[PDB]
Amino acid sequence: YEAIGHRVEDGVAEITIKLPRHRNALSVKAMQEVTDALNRAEEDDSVGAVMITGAEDAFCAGFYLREIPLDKGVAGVRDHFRIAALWWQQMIHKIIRVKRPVLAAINGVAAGGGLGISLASDMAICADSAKFVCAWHTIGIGNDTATSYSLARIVGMRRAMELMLTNRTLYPEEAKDWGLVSRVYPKDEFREVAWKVARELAAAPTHLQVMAKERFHAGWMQPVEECTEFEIQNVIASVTHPHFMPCLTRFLDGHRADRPQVELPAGV
Amino acid sequence: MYEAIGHRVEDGVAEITIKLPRHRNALSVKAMQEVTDALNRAEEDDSVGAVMITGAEDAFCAGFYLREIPLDKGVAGVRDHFRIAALWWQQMIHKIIRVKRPVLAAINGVAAGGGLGISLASDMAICADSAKFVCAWHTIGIGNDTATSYSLARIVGMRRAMELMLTNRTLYPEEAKDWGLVSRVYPKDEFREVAWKVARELAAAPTHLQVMAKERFHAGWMQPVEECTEFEIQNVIASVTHPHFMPCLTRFLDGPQVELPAGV
């Protein structure tokens, strides 16, 4: 890849937003590469989870404003946004639809599209040095990157509306209180903690994960009876899968099902 | 009488006790059949104003009764049992959500898998300080169910729903309360009585009004504002037409419904 950092180890496909000089804003090319990378992860039997993080001390500053053409008129501007907006779309959608759990490791500021990415991921943790901001209004653009889908689904309509309208910066503590992030860790221990959490996610049963993830997205909008129908189909498939019997055996042999799949350290 | 569950009717409350204490109150097929019947019966009963679901002893419900799974019939034997069992979990969960009575979940201890499902499907939930919640699905190796794909996010939001399930983390009362999973937490020793009082109060409150609110809440989550108001309006109209209305008004003109103690 030439615009993103990418590495697969320990069952984790790690995608790094890398444009640190410009606060990890996402270029059109980079977005194409993240999506490709998400496609490849889903196709890799050796990948159990995906982790998205930023290079250095920023997560992602959102739209790459420095690539917008300024010498071609409104047209040039409209044209650029049609293309970049399509890639923000492709990528955000892939994060939500990919058949792998995605951990957003928020190591610094997440603005605009950056916040969009954080909201689209399955799990999210951040460094105590991280921060979140809508930023759309500041730059005079209508909000996107599925913020009309994700934000309210996580924080409720009221907080979603306030954050977008006030445009204020949300800090770790509050982000955690809001459900935006599950846990916060000292900056210095952040990377290590996050990689370990990703390895666990990767080691846990992908099949079950995917069933949970797809159902969560779909179920939000379905009535109970349709929900159960789809869940039951998953149940039947899961107990037919070779993974099951051995777990039952263990349970019957005294091993408790409250054993965690992923251990999230307390953090701060 | 029932053979796999505890069941009492007192002070307008139909108390359903999940009773398989030696096995942590896991729900057997038979039991689920009984629970559902009990729910139907309560709704058919003019004397019943509310339903209470609770577990026997110190456990709420450990979920799927795994000791009921046949091991001498191969994979198909397993599969066939789940089809039946899952159908029953389904009939029960749906009923809790659709029954025309308020349903109080009195979480007296551990709620795992289907036990958590029950907790989430209920109208109101309170737990003892000794209770805890765990998905279990991802460790026991079974795809999630018991409408967790419906109720969990509606309660705690998508992020927390996904986290809980994925990590298989155990949620203790203080966080469960902060999350909204339970409304109040009470000391283990005072628990049953607090719960009984709350239930008696719900039973006493106007059933028709409760049903209207219950049904609307479920439906409205998914409807546009204009459709929600048409349904609410129909409810208002019917309500001011009901005998209960006038007396309330005059009393108002002339000069809480359920008291949830603060707990811990």
Next chain:
Amino acid sequence: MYEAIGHRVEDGVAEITIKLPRHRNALSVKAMQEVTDALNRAEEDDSVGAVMITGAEDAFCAGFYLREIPLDKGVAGVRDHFRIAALWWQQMIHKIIRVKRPVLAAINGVAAGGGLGISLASDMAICADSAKFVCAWHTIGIGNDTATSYSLARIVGMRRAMELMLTNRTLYPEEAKDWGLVSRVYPKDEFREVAWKVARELAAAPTHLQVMAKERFHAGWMQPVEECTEFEIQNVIASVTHPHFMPCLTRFLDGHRADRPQVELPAGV
């Protein structure tokens, strides 16, 4: 003009004041029509940037105006009345949610039944430490309405929505804030002023952008991500096309940075 509500347009804010303080600011049929009218007018006024709904005195709104219900005409009379007033509660509530302007609910005191509905239908909500919230329906013997089956769970989650309704408990500011029912709480004596500045800040902010966000938030709650992004993109494209865009971009590149949020909500208590 208006004879049943307080109203003004100043500093870009259309301020609607619920005014029936002897009666705790309950809403009469006539005031409801006026509130709806004023919302319509705000939306058509180039001079208005935001709307603020507040109560006169020490109450926000006690809901349905009970003293309007005909006791002399039996059942059909009572019902006929409810038919009309419910319609107006409805037209009003709908408008708050659909109006093309950000609406701030400045809850200066008690919000009961329909008053609670108004506060839930608004886009932003802040309250005085002296305020309180209560469903009240279950007590007066009426089915819940005013879009509570829409707004409440969207805000506080389904469990807390259910709870509040069923217990008919009174929610105080600290808890309402914890729940997300209100964003901030301010000392009673400071309230009016804080709220008025928040409204002015909301009005000064770019309405076009505000509207886009508001419409997508309501719509998107019920739509799949692919459908959400398509509508979002339509707004992105219209927004960078609009004259306001370029100046913001240039400034960013130039090194200009905002000294504060578009809308500042002071910490409060």
